[PDB]
Every structure is written in structure tokens, then in C-alpha cells.
Write an enzyme that holds these catalytic residues in place. Structure first.
Site, short mmCIF file in Angstrom:
data_model
loop_
_atom_site.label_atom_id
_atom_site.label_comp_id
_atom_site.label_asym_id
_atom_site.label_seq_id
_atom_site.Cartn_x
_atom_site.Cartn_y
_atom_site.Cartn_z
N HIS A 58 -0.04 -9.27 -5.15
CA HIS A 58 -0.91 -9.21 -3.99
C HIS A 58 -0.58 -8.06 -3.04
O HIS A 58 -1.21 -7.94 -1.99
CB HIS A 58 -0.82 -10.54 -3.23
CG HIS A 58 -2.04 -10.88 -2.45
ND1 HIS A 58 -2.07 -10.89 -1.07
CD2 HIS A 58 -3.28 -11.25 -2.85
CE1 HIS A 58 -3.27 -11.24 -0.65
NE2 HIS A 58 -4.03 -11.46 -1.71
N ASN A 89 -0.69 -14.28 2.94
CA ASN A 89 -1.58 -15.15 3.69
C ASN A 89 -0.82 -16.39 4.15
O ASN A 89 0.31 -16.64 3.75
CB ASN A 89 -2.78 -15.55 2.84
CG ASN A 89 -3.77 -14.41 2.64
OD1 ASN A 89 -4.46 -14.01 3.57
ND2 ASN A 89 -3.83 -13.89 1.42
N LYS A 129 -3.84 -10.10 8.06
CA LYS A 129 -2.70 -11.01 8.09
C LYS A 129 -1.58 -10.37 8.89
O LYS A 129 -0.95 -9.41 8.43
CB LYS A 129 -2.21 -11.34 6.67
CG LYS A 129 -3.31 -11.52 5.63
CD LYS A 129 -3.43 -10.31 4.72
CE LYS A 129 -4.22 -10.62 3.45
NZ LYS A 129 -5.54 -11.23 3.76
#
Ligand SMILES: *[C@@H]1O[C@H](CO)[C@@H](O[C@@H]2O[C@H](CO)[C@@H](O[C@@H]3O[C@H](CO[C@H]4O[C@H](CO[C@H]5O[C@H](CO)[C@@H](O)[C@H](O)[C@@H]5O)[C@@H](O)[C@H](O[C@H]5O[C@H](CO)[C@@H](O)[C@H](O)[C@@H]5O)[C@@H]4O)[C@@H](O)[C@H](O[C@H]4O[C@H](CO)[C@@H](O)[C@H](O)[C@@H]4O)[C@@H]3O)[C@H](O)[C@H]2NC(C)=O)[C@H](O)[C@H]1NC(C)=O
Ligand SMILES: *[C@@H]1O[C@H](CO)[C@@H](O[C@@H]2O[C@H](CO)[C@@H](O[C@@H]3O[C@H](CO[C@H]4O[C@H](CO[C@H]5O[C@H](CO)[C@@H](O)[C@H](O)[C@@H]5O)[C@@H](O)[C@H](O[C@H]5O[C@H](CO)[C@@H](O)[C@H](O)[C@@H]5O)[C@@H]4O)[C@@H](O)[C@H](O[C@H]4O[C@H](CO)[C@@H](O)[C@H](O)[C@@H]4O)[C@@H]3O)[C@H](O)[C@H]2NC(C)=O)[C@H](O)[C@H]1NC(C)=O
Ligand SMILES: *[C@@H]1O[C@H](CO)[C@@H](O[C@@H]2O[C@H](CO)[C@@H](O[C@@H]3O[C@H](CO)[C@@H](O)[C@H](O)[C@@H]3O)[C@H](O)[C@H]2NC(C)=O)[C@H](O)[C@H]1NC(C)=O
Ligand SMILES: *[C@@H]1O[C@H](CO)[C@@H](O[C@@H]2O[C@H](CO)[C@@H](O[C@@H]3O[C@H](CO)[C@@H](O)[C@H](O)[C@@H]3O)[C@H](O)[C@H]2NC(C)=O)[C@H](O)[C@H]1NC(C)=O
Ligand SMILES: *[C@@H]1O[C@H](CO)[C@@H](O[C@@H]2O[C@H](CO)[C@@H](O)[C@H](O)[C@H]2NC(C)=O)[C@H](O)[C@H]1NC(C)=O
Ligand SMILES: *[C@@H]1O[C@H](CO)[C@@H](O[C@@H]2O[C@H](CO)[C@@H](O)[C@H](O)[C@H]2NC(C)=O)[C@H](O)[C@H]1NC(C)=O
Lengths: 426, 426
Positions: A352, A154, A139
Site C-alpha cells: 500500500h 488507513n 490519511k
């Protein structure tokens, strides 16, 4: 490197651009930090600013695209921002911005990418499964060959409002931006029909800026050394440091502490149906703690989809915390509380971030810490070292300490009912 | 290997001697095993038989010599046997047996060796500290270039009556005896004044019998494959398998179970004042358990001199026993109970065995399982594989299971008061 002070070891040209790095976080809806004496710009606003300033080009390396409620079959206010992002993206090509988007081969047509294709952006799907058995997990954004975002977020509206993310935006650093564009071009070349990985990449992909000779930059008005590492090895030219080597160099160079926050940590090839044990990072951490008395803090995310087999391995590491060895390894689980209204939001409410910080260096990656991500799957990491005591490194350390001392982090003996969300590791 | 069925891979000549292997144990005074449906000859009686039958030569590789009460400054009946052993040893040279004894450089004159020198035996002190930073830790006997003992028993009367030991005596196996004599000759050469390790050992030290091409022997009337591995690497000619490689090959080849009994197990360079982490064996065991579902049983000795830092590491391994991974690793501590009368006996009442057995192979060594023993310190191991289901392998498995289920083995959570002796790991 002068050929007379250091011989054939010529140090590449320094960068004179006024590079400035900003940590950018996504804090899910409902998470509050009492102290957190400072806050970082959100991923949404950094992305929107980059899109607003874009005038020449945008390259995006991406794993998947769900920026709209239609994509997720939901109806949530908190999705707005992804949709807003999508909107601004569709405005780039019509006004003259060359847009190129590399995405891991999806399991069906994607709405966002079709709309962007109609807007004039170029989109290529990279089938990493057929090439390396991995996926295009990277990403990052490169804007006008001058700015870039590298982090865990993302192209997903959840990543903005319902999933905790960490990343960095480097502004006014064209040297490093072009260097990252080389990795993007690897992806772009492999995104065509019938292309295969060359045994040796053409020189246009190679780089002089790596672990041995990092790029000298002016970061926030202070000298610093930076470089970008790449995975998997078959995608790295000879001059490009593999992601695993960069990570392990940061681990082995630490003399005081190593703070790591990653959604998943597994000393295994998670995949590869004939399973494989993979202790590279695990052994590096054990080595640091035992040989050099480095205090190791491991913050691992836990949600309903976590691999339960993680627990044992983490416990194994935690077992090394001992008085006689003087080894100091601690493991905590970061859990994102969920509401009944948030529970309908599919695949959300999890931390994340994928980053590591020591007393000397910063590492910001796109990959979880399991074997595949470093051998078969695409990933990128930014490594920065700065001799001062403030800077981006201190900001990363502050972020980690905030998350570590927050009530959302719990020990491995905590009860599953006291965390506020499903946690297979408790 | 026929040069036409296998090419340049010529399989060395088979051995036609009627080799017979006997497991020999030292069971300290006071240890009883209710079931133990079979028992093995004691180390004392095997040694005495070998001395009685000796007619041409005896070579002993040794760590230290305390065979008499005078040596230990004690007065114990149970010392008799060592003294008896010493007596018989002094009778060898006067009747024509050529005796050569290699001993690690002691910290002062040794009585037993002076008496043996007066009896006519040759004695050489090997200063491994000056050569490799290690010591001459190997314990083995070669008799008439036909028989040999390899095991944990030192030239110490305690090793016979107050310290538990395991080893093997191979009879009527002249091929393997001469092969072991090659290792002894390495020691003997280095025992001179001013000798240094050659970069390449002369061919007389090299061997064709190793992991790749083990010696084919007739063991107890059945075909078997055997070879001898050596440590440290600088003492191994090109054809000689290093001890660590042999051990790890046994570990990696196991498909059902791995039973290990060693006095000390440490994934570190115990020594090397700048300490070093050493996960070779640890990683091998984790790999076996995770990748191949091998059930790993680790029986570690514990007494008053045990390194406490062992505990954490063992706990680390034990943490991998998990339902989700299907990994099965168990750790137990073997403790030798002591009496107040035995407590005066210096440095005794501990399990000294160093061996490993799987469902396919047997490994009997002289070294504890820490880094130094495989990189700097002298050691030897015997490796045997036999296609049948009985044999020496089954005897080793039975010994391990007896010791494992015995009341002297305790889990890591056991209280220090329920073991019958000092145990720093509990
Ligand atoms: C290297 O150089 C670079 C570039 O110079 C530098 O990057 C700067 O870093 C600093 C420090 O991290 C940044 O300053 C911080 O910015 C935080 C984010 O600010 C943005 O977001 C705010 C939140 O808006 C959302 O939420 C509010 C909720 O109330 C809502 O209204 C909004 O609509 C939105 O939903 C937003 O308010 C803010 O806008 C204000 O602030 C900017 C300042 O940039 C100002 O220009 C605006 O006019 C407006 O007044 C902005 O959009 C911010 O949270 C943070 O605040 C902390 O400190 C205050 C003061 O103590 C506390 O009260 C607060 O609780 C926080 O803890 C702080 O201001 C700065 O934005 C970066 N610059 C860029 C361009 O990115 C690096 O740091 C340098 N590196 C080093 C090592 O020095
Ligand atoms: C490959 O081939 C080789 C060679 O053929 C073979 O090696 C043989 O292996 C077998 C099995 O392990 C051995 O037989 C065992 O021997 C054990 C040890 O016996 C010796 O020690 C005995 C103990 O003596 C001490 O303690 C007693 C206490 O009471 C005391 O009196 C003594 O003074 C001393 O302090 C000793 O008694 C024994 O002498 C008797 O037995 C021998 C037999 O060899 C006999 O010849 C003598 O005349 C005398 O009667 C000997 O000196 C032994 O403990 C063990 O006994 C077990 O089984 C019995 C029967 O069920 C149980 O009641 C008992 O509790 C034990 O559990 C068994 O006899 C044999 O000695 C080896 N041979 C050689 C030469 O070493 C390998 O096994 C073969 N490999 C394979 C895979 O097949
Ligand atoms: C998600 O899917 C729904 C359903 O397909 C989409 O609904 C559509 O929303 C747009 C505006 O958001 C509607 O267009 C509107 O038409 C009126 C007609 O006069 C016009 O005045 C407005 O300015 C606007 O353009 C459209 O009719 C509507 N479609 C349906 C079938 O209801 C929604 O747009 C999708 N969202 C995203 C982010 O893709
Ligand atoms: C341990 O050290 C003691 C003390 O130095 C040794 O004692 C010695 O023991 C021997 C016999 O065991 C004695 O020799 C005896 O002499 C008589 C004299 O007639 C003789 O008839 C006997 O047949 C025997 O040879 C010796 O005198 C004695 N020395 C002293 C000073 O008491 C002991 O031998 C040592 N043990 C070992 C295993 O080395
Ligand atoms: C990156 O470079 C741009 C362009 O030089 C910088 O934009 C300037 O910012 C200062 C302070 O905010 C303003 O006074 C100037 O007017 C701006 N110039 C232009 C042309 O916009 C920007 O500050 C630099 N840093 C970042 C993080 O963007
Ligand atoms: C090793 O070889 C010797 C010599 O061949 C064997 O000794 C024989 O043993 C059998 C059975 O015990 C006797 O019947 C013979 O009389 C012995 N011969 C001699 C010359 O002593 C011995 O058994 C073999 N095995 C071991 C373990 O020593």
C-alpha cells in the site's frame, strides 16, 4: 530574503524546533527480509506511542475506519492492534484530549466513529463527491500541534498486520504540525452541513511554506528544507503547493535516479465515465529518463483487485529502456503472498506504500498515482530535501532497494503461478 | 458570419474557383502493387504538365537541388526525369515566366540554381539556421497564382524515380494558391541579406483562412473546407494556423481511425544538443486511442540512415495495444528493397511520404514528425475536410491501405534479413 539582497522575496521565518523524522512501516504477517540490515518502527507502535504521549489534541484525516473484527465480519488474531489502537483512541477525550476526526462520507454508519463520538471525540463526515467529485482519501495525524504522521496507513486493523504500509512520523516539529493542521482545517470546515468551497480561502488557511520558499527546519540535528503539498487544487490556498506540482518538481529536479513505490500507477483519469488520458506524471518520467539519463525504477503493487489496464501502460514505459537512447526505465510488480487462512481476510495482502525518493529529495504521499487523486480527491504529501548524504532520504532509498531486490518483486513477464497471490497484471 | 447571426465572427469570402485536387506519387523503380485498383499520376508528369502550362509565374520553396547525375556524381538512366524537369525549368524565364526560387542555405554552390540564374530565374538562399536554428525544409510550387503542388518530393531526381513520395497538386484554385504565396513571400523576404524576422509580420502576409475559419472551396464539384498551416511559429502571422496545431486538431477530431505515414517519427527534439523530450504528437495519439477508441496505424519508413532510437519509442506506442483498455495502436515499418545497382545510387530507396488521413480529414505535409520540424524548421501542410464519403480523403485512405497491406510493410519483430534493405530498426 532581506528586501535588499533579494527584494520582495522575503524568506519566511525558520523553525527552531528539534524536528526528528522516523520512517514507520507496516510489514504484513509472513513477509521476511533476509538482509534489511536495519528495520523501522511499526505503524502500530508509533501510533500507540503518539496516543500515549498525547495531552492536548489529536486531529485525524481519514478515508475509512475498520479497526475491529466486528467491522470486517471476521475473527482474526492479527486484528488486535487496530482494536488496541481504537481502545487507546477512546481514552483520549475522557482524559481531556480534544479529538477531531474528519472522514470521507461513508456508505452507512460506522461503528468505530460512533464509539469515539460516545467517548467525547468530534467526528465530521466530508462529502467530497458533492464538492469536487472526489473523496477524502487523506490519511494523517496531528498530535498536540507538535507531532504528525503522514503516510498510507488507513484507520484499518489490516493496515497494521495484513497490508504493507509506509509513512513518516515527525516529532517535535510544531511549525510543520501547525502547517498540516491548516489542511486539516480545510477538511473540518468542509465537513459541516451546507458548506461549500470558497473561491478564495481565508488567510488562516494560507501558508508561506511551499515549493518556492520551503520551511527551514532542523531535522535530526541537520538543516533541511521541508513543506507539505495538498490536493485537490480547489482546497489549496494561493501559498499552498498542489500535490501534483510538488511531485513533478521532485521528478524534474532528479539528476541521478527516481525510485517510486505506489500501489496503483495509471496515466489516466481512472474515473470520469467519459474517460480521460492523463500523462502528467508519465511524461515527467519519460522526460527525466530521456533528457537527463535518470534511472527510473517503478515498483507497482499487484493483487486480485488491480486494474488490468495498468499492464499495457507500464509496458509502454518499460519499452523506453533502450541502448541507443541510453534511457533506463524498469518496472517491477510487488506481490504480497497469501495463505488460505489469510485469503478469508477481506481486502488484504497488498503493498500500500505511496512514496518516491531521488538522490536529492524525499516525497511521501497519501495518494495513488492516477489523475483523480491529483485533481478531485483529497491528498497530502511531505517533501523533504537535506544537503547531507545520510538522513531520511537514505532511509527511504534503503527501504525501496530492500523491497526492489526482495523475492516479492517480479518482472512483467513473470508467470502468475510464481508470485504467491492473484495478480491480474501477470 | 453575418454580425447578426454570429456576431463579430465574420466568415471570410468563399472561393468560387473550380478547384480540383490530384494526389501525385513517386513510386521508386521496382515497386509493384498487385491490387492497387487505381493509380495516381507520377510527380514527374504532374510537374512537367505544370511547367508546360505555366505562363506568368512560378514560385518554388525547396530544401536542396540535385536534379542531374552531375549533382550526385553518378550515371543512372533513372535520373533523366529530374534532368528533364531541370531542362523545362530553364525554359521558363526566357519565354517570360517570372521564376522565384527559395532554397535553404546550401553548403556550397549548387549547379542547378546557377544554371537557372543564368536562364533568368531569381534565386534566394534562406539561412534559417541563423534565424530559428532550423532549415528551409518546405517543398512546394505555386504556378501562375492558380495551381500549386504541396508534398514531400524535393527538387531531386531521386525523388522522382528512386524515392517514394506523396503530394497533392491543386489546380484552378487561385484563392488557395495566393494564400500559399503568402508563405512563400515570408521565405522570399527572409532570403535577403540582413533581413530578420519581424515581431509582427505586415498585413500582406496575414490570412483569414485557418483552422477557425477555413476557406470554403468547390473541390471537384463538391463543397469542402481547406486551409494551409505553416511552421515555424515565428513565421506565422496571427491569422495563420501553425502546422503543429493543425496536425493535432486533425488528431483530436478523429472519431474512427488515424492513419499516418511519415519517414521519421520521433517524440523528441532530434537536435538541440541538450536533448529535449517532445510528446505533443505522441500524447495526441495516445489520447485518441484511449479516450475515443480511435484505431491508430503508424507506418514509419526504415533505411540505412534511420535513427535507431526510433524503435523504442515506436515500441512504447505499440505497447498500448491492449484488450482491457480497448486501445488499438499498430506500428509497421515500410522498407524499399534495394538492388546492388541501386545501392550505388546515394541516399535513395526509402519511403519519403509525410501525410495523415482520418475518416473526416486529410493532412498532407512537408515535415517529418519530430519536434524541430514544428518549432524551428520551415514547413507547410494542406488540410482538407469534405462532408461526402468519396473525394481526396478516400484516395488518401486507399493509398495508405495499399502501402500498409503491401509486402514492403513489416512488423517490429521482423528479421532484418527479410526486408530487402538495411533497416537499423530491425
Ligand atoms: C532521527 O531521530 C529519530 C529519533 O531519534 C530516529 O528514529 C529512530 O530510528 C532508529 C532506526 O530506524 C530506530 O531504531 C530501530 O527501531 C526498530 C523498531 O524498534 C521498535 O520495535 C522493535 C520490534 O518490536 C516488535 O517486534 C519484536 C520482535 O522480537 C517483539 O518482541 C516486540 O514485542 C514487537 O512486537 C522493538 O524490539 C524495539 O524495542 C527495542 O529497541 C528499542 C530501540 O529504540 C529499545 O529502546 C527497547 O528497549 C527495545 O530494546 C522498538 O520498540 C528496530 O527494529 C531497529 O532494529 C534494527 O537494528 C538492530 C541492530 O542492528 C537489528 O538487530 C534489527 O534486526 C533491526 O534491523 C532499530 O533499533 C529508533 O527506534 C527510532 N526512534 C524512535 C523514537 O522512533 C531516526 O532514525 C533519526 N533519523 C536519522 C536519519 O538518523
Ligand atoms: C478531381 O479532379 C481531378 C481532375 O479531373 C482528378 O484527377 C484525375 O484523377 C484520376 C484518378 O487518379 C487520374 O486518372 C488516373 O491517372 C493515372 C496516371 O495516368 C497518367 O500516367 C499514366 C502512366 O504513364 C506512365 O507509365 C506508362 C506505363 O505504361 C507509360 O506508358 C507512360 O509513358 C508513363 O511512363 C499514363 O498512361 C496516363 O496516360 C493515359 O491516361 C490518361 C488519363 O488521364 C489519358 O488521357 C491518356 O491519353 C493516356 O491514355 C497518364 O499520363 C493512371 O495510372 C490511372 O489508371 C488507373 O486506372 C486504370 C483503369 O482502371 C488501370 O488500368 C490502371 O492500372 C490504374 O490503376 C488513372 O487513369 C487522372 O489522370 C487525374 N487527372 C489529372 C488531370 O491529373 C481527381 O481524381 C478528382 N478527384 C476525385 C476525388 O474525384
Ligand atoms: C465485537 O462484537 C461482539 C459481539 O457483539 C462483542 O462481544 C462483547 O465482548 C465484551 C468484552 O469483549 C463482553 O463484555 C464482557 O461482559 C462481561 C460480563 O460480566 C464482563 O465481565 C467483561 O469484563 C466484558 O465487559 C460482551 O458481553 C460481549 N457481547 C456479546 C453479545 O457477546 C465484542 O466486544 C465486540 N468487539 C469490539 C472490539 O467491539
Ligand atoms: C554533366 O556533365 C558533363 C560533363 O561536364 C556534361 O557533358 C556535356 O554534355 C553536352 C551535351 O549533353 C555536350 O554538349 C554537346 O556538344 C556537341 C558539340 O558539337 C553538340 O553538338 C551537342 O549538341 C551538345 O551540345 C558537352 O560537350 C559535354 N561536355 C563534356 C565536357 O563532355 C553534361 O552535359 C552534364 N549534364 C548536365 C545535365 O548538366
Ligand atoms: C521529542 O521531545 C521530547 C521532549 O523533549 C524528547 O523526550 C526526551 O527524550 C530524551 C532521550 O530519549 C530523554 O532523555 C528525556 O528525558 C525526554 N524528555 C521528556 C520530557 O520526555 C524526545 O526524545 C524528542 N524526540 C522524540 C522522537 O520524541
Ligand atoms: C483547369 O482549368 C482548365 C481551363 O479551364 C481546364 O482545361 C479545360 O479542360 C477541359 C477538359 O479537359 C477541356 O475540354 C478544355 O478545352 C480545357 N480548357 C482549356 C482552356 O485548356 C482544366 O481541365 C481544369 N482542370 C485541370 C486539372 O487542369
Amino acid at each position: 530574503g532581506d528586501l535588499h539582497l533579494f527584494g520582495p522575496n522575503q524568506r519566511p521565518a525558520p523553525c527552531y524546533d528539534p524536528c526528528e523524522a522516523v520512517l514507520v512501516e507496516s510489514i504484513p504477517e509472513g513477509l521476511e527480509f533476509p538482509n534489511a540490515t536495519t528495520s523501522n518502527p511499526s505503524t502500530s507502535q508509533a501510533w500507540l506511542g503518539l496516543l500515549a504521549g498525547a495531552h492536548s489534541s489529536l486531529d485525524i484525516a481519514s478515508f475509512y475506519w475498520t479497526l475491529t473484527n466486528n467491522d470486517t465480519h471476521t475473527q482474526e488474531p492479527s486484528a488486535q492492534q487496530g482494536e488496541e489502537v481504537l481502545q487507546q483512541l477512546q481514552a483520549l477525550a475522557p482524559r481531556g484530549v480534544k479529538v477531531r476526526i474528519a472522514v470521507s462520507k461513508p456508505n452507512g454508519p460506522l461503528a468505530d466513529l460512533q464509539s469515539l463520538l460516545q467517548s467525547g471525540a468530534q467526528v465530521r463526515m466530508v462529502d467530497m463527491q458533492k464538492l469536487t467529485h472526489g473523496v477524502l482519501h487523506t490519511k494523517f495525524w496531528v498530535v498536540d500541534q507538535t507531532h504528525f504522521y503522514l503516510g498510507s496507513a488507513n484507520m484499518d486493523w489490516r493496515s497494521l498486520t495484513q497490508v504493507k504500509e509506509l509513512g513518516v512520523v515527525m516529532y517535535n516539529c510544531s511549525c510543520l504540525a501547525r502547517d498540516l493542521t491548516k489542511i486539516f482545517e480545510a477538511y473540518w470546515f468542509l465537513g459541516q452541513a451546507g458548506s461549500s468551497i470558497p473561491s478564495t480561502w481565508p488567510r488562516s488557511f494560507d501558508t508561506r511554506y511551499n515549493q518556492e520558499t520551503p520551511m527551514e527546519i532542523c531535522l535530526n540535528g541537520t538543516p533541511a528544507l521541508a513543506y507539505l503539498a495538498s490536493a485537490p487544487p480547489p482546497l489549496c490556498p494561493s501559498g499552498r503547493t498542489p500535490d501534483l506540482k510538488a511531485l513533478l518538481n521532485v521528478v524534474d529536479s532528479a539528476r541521478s535516479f527516481i525510485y517510486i513505490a505506489v500501489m496503483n500507477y495509471l496515466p489516466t483519469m481512472e474515473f470520469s465515465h467519459p474517460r480521460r488520458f492523463w500523462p502528467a506524471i508519465d511524461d515527467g518520467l519519460r522526460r527525466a529518463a530521456y533528457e537527463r539519463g535518470v534511472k527510473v525504477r517503478l515498483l507497482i503493487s499487484c493483487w486480485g483487485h488491480s486494474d488490468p489496464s495498468m499492464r499495457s501502460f507500464l509496458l509502454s514505459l518499460a519499452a523506453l529502456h533502450d541502448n541507443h537512447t541510453h534511457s533506463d526505465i524498469q518496472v517491477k510488480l510487488f506481490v504480497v503472498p497469501t495463505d488460505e487462512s489469510q485469503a478469508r481476510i477481506p481486502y488484504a495482502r497488498v503493498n500500500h506504500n505511496k512514496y518516491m525518493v531521488t538522490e536529492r529529495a524525499s516525497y511521501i504521499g497519501t495518494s495513488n498515482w492516477s489523475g483523480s487523486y491529483f485533481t478531485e480527491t483529497a491528498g497530502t504529501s511531505l517533501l523533504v530535501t537535506q544537503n547531507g548524504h545520510g538522513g531520511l532520504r537514505s532511509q527511504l532509498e534503503a527501504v525501496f532497494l530492500r523491497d526492489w531486490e526482495s523475492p516479492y518483486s517480479h518482472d512483467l513477464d513473470t508467470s502468475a503461478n510464481s508470485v504467491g497471490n492473484a495478480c491480474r497484471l501477470l
